[PDB]
Amino acid sequence: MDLHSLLELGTKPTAPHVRNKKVILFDTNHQVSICNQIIDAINSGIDLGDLLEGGLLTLCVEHYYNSDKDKFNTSPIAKYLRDAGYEFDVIKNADATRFLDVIPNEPHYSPLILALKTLESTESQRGRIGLFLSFCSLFLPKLVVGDRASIEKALRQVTVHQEQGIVTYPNHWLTTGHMKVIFGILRSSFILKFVLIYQGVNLVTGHDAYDSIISNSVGQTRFSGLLIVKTVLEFILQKTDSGVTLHPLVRTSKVKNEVASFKQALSNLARHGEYAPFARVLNLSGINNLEHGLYPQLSAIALGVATAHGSTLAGVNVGEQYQQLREAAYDAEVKLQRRHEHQEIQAIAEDDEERKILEQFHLQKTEITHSQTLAVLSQKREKLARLAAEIENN
Amino acid sequence: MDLHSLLELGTKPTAPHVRNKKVILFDTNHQVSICNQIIDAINSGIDLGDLLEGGLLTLCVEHYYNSDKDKFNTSPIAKYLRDAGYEFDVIKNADATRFLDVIPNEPHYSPLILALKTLESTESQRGRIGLFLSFCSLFLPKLVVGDRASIEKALRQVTVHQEQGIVTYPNHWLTTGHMKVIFGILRSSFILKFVLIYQGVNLVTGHDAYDSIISNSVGQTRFSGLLIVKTVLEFILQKTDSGVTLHPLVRTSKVKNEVASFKQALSNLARHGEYAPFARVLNLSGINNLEHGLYPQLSAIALGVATAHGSTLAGVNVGEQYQQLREAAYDAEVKLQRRHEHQEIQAIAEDDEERKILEQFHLQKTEITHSQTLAVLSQKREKLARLAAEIENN
RNA sequence: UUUUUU
RNA sequence: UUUUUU
RNA sequence: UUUUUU
């Protein structure tokens, strides 16, 4: 009897799940105009409550699969969503021409029926759907950080993609109320985030403007709320050709339960295949075992070692109960790393003139990264002070 | 269990993709006049929105394959676009004589139907189509740099090809509004850029004026947004006959994760075969793994070493967070390279008179490249100051 | 709960 | 995001 | 892009 196996119980799911959901699909002869009516109903602020996930699935099936519902069901999006517990009931209506005529006759859709009579539609192309999905992909990196972080990252990606000349969005899409409602409809829908992630990752070759925007934004969403995974696996568990060895600041007996617990949490997380970098955004099952408050010493030490290697990770906020250990591991790794690079410069040169040139280069390089780290720290302090002045103002 | 394989997940596409697109093809008895009507509809500023990609495919099939649609489907352009996820639905209309009569009866094409009634057509030859495609190939090098860089490179290629006597373009094609709209229609279309790249690379022998312009402009587009690939693979990972060895400025332990990560990104990029130099323009799948912000030390060091070897790479702009490391690696490589050429001049001579002549030659050659590098730096500084004075003026 | 850069 | 030359 | 002579 192993009594210590009781501390790992109640984490892993045991079976594939018998929970079944129901999202509707619209089968219409006028699918492009139906889809554009869903776009301008969402953009107008109409809370289209239980029909949101089915309407967003009709936009994504219409854009990616020409709304045929036959090669959609063969496709691995639907195989994944069928194993996740979704069921597609197809609301077939061949003579429908408006969004009101396809909503089923239930009593609780009556605020939506009253809301959509006053909704005016401007006639628009098929490409407004792909414009909407490429705009919705811009909220995907820094989605789990908040709404202000998502809206600022998405505004920065709008100006980056408009200097490229790839896209241009309308000016009433870029107001802060509308970017609040698009953050709201993206954070809650699993199917919208998953099919933006799937068509971002798995499209190889023929990219239009929208496919390239979605593929660029899914590429910046990799390990989004999982900075602890990236800092521990790069800087704490170094891999050699001989094998994985620990770091000197984690190689004691106070830390070793967190290290052995973190390796079990990572081996749980890698059951998800190619969606393990997107685990915090898609809210997968191993997500509770990788928080900062489960590893209070491993996380602050790993961020201090990571900040000592790179300039930009001195902008990462932590809680007040992790700051001083982060600052201490930063100082210790600065001293250890200057000892190591002095030994390596003495190892790889050939003359005294060669080691004089390489010594002058690596001391100038270290002074460059230290001055950049202090610049990032000063603008982080001013950003926190400006946010606190806005919170005091509001 | 290799836990470090989780950091490479979510990058490579797993399957050939089940996303299918629909571009139309026009099958008409009067294909030359239909194609010239698409040329003067595009040149007039008519936003021919969803029919743009099919109209450009009809121009390219009419120019390259005589619009027969039977040897087009055997040809490897269509095999590549069929594996990319395109489907060609052929709008057969044997008695059509205008561009209005072949547009399908949909409600969202009605601004285009109203736009094309007022469009006047001048009757023109088959060679205005090849004139349009050779003009569209001139935006292909420096396409990913911007619109002003594309329009200035394309104006320079117009004057180069008119001193040759190969071509002459009409004077209303060379205004900046029209070159803005041809940059706009080339940046977004995958099929136009791909078939200009395919017929530029794979045409061996019988070139007319337009084929030679397209082949010259596709030859200058090789590694267009991939300067990091060219500078690292030339100057940082030197190949000997014995094998690949690193550079002394990247041979430490702070750099080795970026070097081993860059070799994985290059081995991803070389899955695309002969279209791997054109990966940033065609937006292929390995493109996110080769940015400057993923390798902040390898890229600035590699550009400094490259600038020390050649005069013209002192015109490359970088961000402000990479400039000083570029300047430092430039200084270190200047000192290391003068030590190496002094040793090689002592190795390859036979007398003292021979080494006196070779010493005087190589010191004059180094002074020539240093004065050229300072000239490039001064005109770069004045170009940036003039662009900032125009941005302040506008 | 997450916080940087890209 | 990309930035030079050809 | 090419630049001479024959």
Side-chain angles (χ1 to χ4, degrees):
Chain A
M1 175 61 194
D2 202 45
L3 276 74
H4 284 259
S5 70
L6 197 152
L7 278 182
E8 305 160 351
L9 290 174
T11 66
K12 284 157 275 290
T14 311
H17 201 191
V18 177
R19 154 70 149 158
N20 59 90
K21 294 136 203 159
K22 285 275 204 53
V23 297
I24 47 176
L25 266 181
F26 295 148
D27 186 74
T28 300
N29 281 341
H30 308 77
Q31 203 76 43
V32 178
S33 179
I34 293 303
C35 278
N36 272 263
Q37 270 145 359
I38 303 165
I39 299 304
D40 48 46
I42 280 168
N43 290 342
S44 165
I46 294 172
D47 186 23
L48 62 85
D50 282 353
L51 307 190
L52 178 74
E53 198 76 27
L56 291 169
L57 185 54
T58 53
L59 301 172
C60 297
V61 168
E62 164 58 43
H63 190 264
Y64 285 117
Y65 290 98
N66 308 325
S67 68
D68 60 349
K69 278 93 176 183
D70 170 347
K71 284 163 291 183
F72 171 66
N73 290 327
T74 284
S75 81
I77 279 179
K79 186 182 177 183
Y80 195 90
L81 293 178
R82 268 191 270 108
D83 289 335
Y86 282 84
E87 273 164 37
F88 313 108
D89 49 353
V90 182
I91 307 302
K92 294 182 184 292
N93 196 358
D95 213 348
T97 192
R98 284 256 279 198
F99 193 35
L100 283 73
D101 309 338
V102 74
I103 294 176
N105 214 47
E106 297 291 325
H108 45 264
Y109 299 139
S110 308
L112 173 58
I113 300 299
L114 182 83
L116 287 164
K117 294 181 176 67
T118 318
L119 172 79
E120 63 271 19
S121 296
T122 62
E123 296 169 348
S124 288
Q125 301 274 329
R126 183 188 165 93
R128 191 178 157 90
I129 309 161
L131 184 72
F132 187 79
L133 280 71
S134 73
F135 193 64
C136 279
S137 75
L138 310 165
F139 292 92
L140 281 184
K142 292 173 70 175
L143 181 88
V144 296
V145 189
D147 57 86
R148 310 188 40 87
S150 305
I151 282 162
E152 281 205 5
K153 176 59 178 154
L155 281 182
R156 174 150 74 246
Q157 280 301 104
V158 175
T159 69
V160 159
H161 286 307
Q162 286 186 13
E163 193 266 322
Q164 294 188 292
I166 278 172
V167 67
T168 284
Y169 302 112
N171 290 318
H172 65 101
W173 278 18
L174 278 297
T175 72
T176 176
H178 186 266
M179 294 177 71
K180 274 181 185 287
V181 309
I182 296 305
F183 179 74
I185 63 170
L186 184 68
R187 186 82 177 100
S188 57
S189 290
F190 179 74
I191 285 174
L192 190 52
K193 295 185 301 209
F194 171 67
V195 308
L196 287 184
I197 276 162
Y198 192 84
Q199 310 285 121
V201 168
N202 294 94
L203 178 61
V204 187
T205 306
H207 287 77
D208 52 298
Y210 315 124
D211 284 356
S212 62
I213 286 172
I214 288 158
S215 182
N216 180 62
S217 290
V218 166
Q220 308 204 318
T221 313
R222 291 187 68 244
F223 303 98
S224 195
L226 310 170
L227 188 42
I228 173 164
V229 183
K230 205 191 284 188
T231 54
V232 171
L233 269 192
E234 285 169 353
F235 297 108
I236 288 296
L237 296 155
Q238 293 83 18
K239 202 170 45 181
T240 78
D241 290 331
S242 48
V244 180
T245 54
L246 276 182
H247 196 68
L249 297 190
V250 299
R251 222 193 294 156
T252 48
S253 188
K254 303 206 60 197
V255 188
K256 73 162 157 84
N257 275 327
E258 302 193 11
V259 165
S261 197
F262 196 79
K263 294 195 296 189
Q264 204 37 50
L266 288 197
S267 181
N268 289 355
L269 197 71
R271 289 187 289 101
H272 302 306
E274 295 290 324
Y275 314 104
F278 307 100
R280 176 86 63 189
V281 289
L282 295 175
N283 284 305
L284 304 186
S285 57
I287 284 298
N288 305 325
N289 296 319
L290 293 155
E291 297 165 4
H292 294 133
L294 289 195
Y295 313 98
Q297 298 163 346
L298 185 65
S299 83
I301 285 169
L303 199 51
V305 171
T307 315
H309 283 275
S311 171
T312 61
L313 286 165
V316 176
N317 274 338
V318 293
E320 270 90 358
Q321 62 266 4
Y322 311 104
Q323 284 178 7
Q324 319 190 21
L325 184 51
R326 181 199 187 182
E327 197 268 330
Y330 170 66
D331 301 333
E333 186 51 42
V334 159
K335 301 164 197 165
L336 287 169
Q337 207 51 49
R338 87 169 84 106
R339 208 181 67 87
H340 286 92
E341 66 182 1
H342 181 80
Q343 272 193 20
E344 279 171 347
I345 287 162
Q346 305 275 76
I348 63 172
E350 307 143 19
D351 294 326
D352 269 359
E353 198 45 67
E354 189 139 12
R355 74 170 50 111
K356 189 184 287 183
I357 301 157
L358 280 71
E359 264 156 26
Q360 159 64 353
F361 167 67
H362 288 95
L363 279 70
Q364 209 187 359
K365 180 189 186 296
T366 315
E367 277 290 294
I368 281 156
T369 70
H370 170 70
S371 307
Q372 279 172 348
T373 314
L374 283 181
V376 170
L377 276 162
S378 59
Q379 71 179 355
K380 154 177 174 174
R381 178 180 76 242
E382 200 60 44
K383 202 202 310 289
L384 265 165
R386 279 190 298 115
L387 183 63
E390 190 62 41
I391 280 172
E392 191 261 348
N393 179 227
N394 290 318
Chain B
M1 175 61 194
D2 202 45
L3 276 74
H4 284 259
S5 70
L6 197 152
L7 278 182
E8 305 160 351
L9 290 174
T11 66
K12 284 157 275 290
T14 311
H17 201 191
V18 177
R19 154 70 149 158
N20 59 90
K21 294 136 203 159
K22 285 275 204 53
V23 297
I24 47 176
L25 266 181
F26 295 148
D27 186 74
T28 300
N29 281 341
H30 308 77
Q31 203 76 43
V32 178
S33 179
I34 293 303
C35 278
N36 272 263
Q37 270 145 359
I38 303 165
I39 299 304
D40 48 46
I42 280 168
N43 290 342
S44 165
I46 294 172
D47 186 23
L48 62 85
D50 282 353
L51 307 190
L52 178 74
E53 198 76 27
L56 291 169
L57 185 54
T58 53
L59 301 172
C60 297
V61 168
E62 164 58 43
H63 190 264
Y64 285 117
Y65 290 98
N66 308 325
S67 68
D68 60 349
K69 278 93 176 183
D70 170 347
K71 284 163 291 183
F72 171 66
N73 290 327
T74 284
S75 81
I77 279 179
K79 186 182 177 183
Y80 195 90
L81 293 178
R82 268 191 270 108
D83 289 335
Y86 282 84
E87 273 164 37
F88 313 108
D89 49 353
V90 182
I91 307 302
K92 294 182 184 292
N93 196 358
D95 213 348
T97 192
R98 284 256 279 198
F99 193 35
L100 283 73
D101 309 338
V102 74
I103 294 176
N105 214 47
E106 297 291 325
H108 45 264
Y109 299 139
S110 308
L112 173 58
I113 300 299
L114 182 83
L116 287 164
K117 294 181 176 67
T118 318
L119 172 79
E120 63 271 19
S121 296
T122 62
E123 296 169 348
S124 288
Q125 301 274 329
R126 183 188 165 93
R128 191 178 157 90
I129 309 161
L131 184 72
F132 187 79
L133 280 71
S134 73
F135 193 64
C136 279
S137 75
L138 310 165
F139 292 92
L140 281 184
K142 292 173 70 175
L143 181 88
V144 296
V145 189
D147 57 86
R148 310 188 40 87
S150 305
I151 282 162
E152 281 205 5
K153 176 59 178 154
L155 281 182
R156 174 150 74 246
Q157 280 301 104
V158 175
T159 69
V160 159
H161 286 307
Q162 286 186 13
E163 193 266 322
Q164 294 188 292
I166 278 172
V167 67
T168 284
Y169 302 112
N171 290 318
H172 65 101
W173 278 18
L174 278 297
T175 72
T176 176
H178 186 266
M179 294 177 71
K180 274 181 185 287
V181 309
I182 296 305
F183 179 74
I185 63 170
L186 184 68
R187 186 82 177 100
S188 57
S189 290
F190 179 74
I191 285 174
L192 190 52
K193 295 185 301 209
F194 171 67
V195 308
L196 287 184
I197 276 162
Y198 192 84
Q199 310 285 121
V201 168
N202 294 94
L203 178 61
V204 187
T205 306
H207 287 77
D208 52 298
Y210 315 124
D211 284 356
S212 62
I213 286 172
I214 288 158
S215 182
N216 180 62
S217 290
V218 166
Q220 308 204 318
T221 313
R222 291 187 68 244
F223 303 98
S224 195
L226 310 170
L227 188 42
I228 173 164
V229 183
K230 205 191 284 188
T231 54
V232 171
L233 269 192
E234 285 169 353
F235 297 108
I236 288 296
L237 296 155
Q238 293 83 18
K239 202 170 45 181
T240 78
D241 290 331
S242 48
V244 180
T245 54
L246 276 182
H247 196 68
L249 297 190
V250 299
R251 222 193 294 156
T252 48
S253 188
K254 303 206 60 197
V255 188
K256 73 162 157 84
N257 275 327
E258 302 193 11
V259 165
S261 197
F262 196 79
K263 294 195 296 189
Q264 204 37 50
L266 288 197
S267 181
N268 289 355
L269 197 71
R271 289 187 289 101
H272 302 306
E274 295 290 324
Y275 314 104
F278 307 100
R280 176 86 63 189
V281 289
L282 295 175
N283 284 305
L284 304 186
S285 57
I287 284 298
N288 305 325
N289 296 319
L290 293 155
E291 297 165 4
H292 294 133
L294 289 195
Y295 313 98
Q297 298 163 346
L298 185 65
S299 83
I301 285 169
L303 199 51
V305 171
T307 315
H309 283 275
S311 171
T312 61
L313 286 165
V316 176
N317 274 338
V318 293
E320 270 90 358
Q321 62 266 4
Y322 311 104
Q323 284 178 7
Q324 319 190 21
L325 184 51
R326 181 199 187 182
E327 197 268 330
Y330 170 66
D331 301 333
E333 186 51 42
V334 159
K335 301 164 197 165
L336 287 169
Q337 207 51 49
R338 87 169 84 106
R339 208 181 67 87
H340 286 92
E341 66 182 1
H342 181 80
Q343 272 193 20
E344 279 171 347
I345 287 162
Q346 305 275 76
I348 63 172
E350 307 143 19
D351 294 326
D352 269 359
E353 198 45 67
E354 189 139 12
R355 74 170 50 111
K356 189 184 287 183
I357 301 157
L358 280 71
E359 264 156 26
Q360 159 64 353
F361 167 67
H362 288 95
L363 279 70
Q364 209 187 359
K365 180 189 186 296
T366 315
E367 277 290 294
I368 281 156
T369 70
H370 170 70
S371 307
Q372 279 172 348
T373 314
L374 283 181
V376 170
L377 276 162
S378 59
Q379 71 179 355
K380 154 177 174 174
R381 178 180 76 242
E382 200 60 44
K383 202 202 310 289
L384 265 165
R386 279 190 298 115
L387 183 63
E390 190 62 41
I391 280 172
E392 191 261 348
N393 179 227
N394 290 318

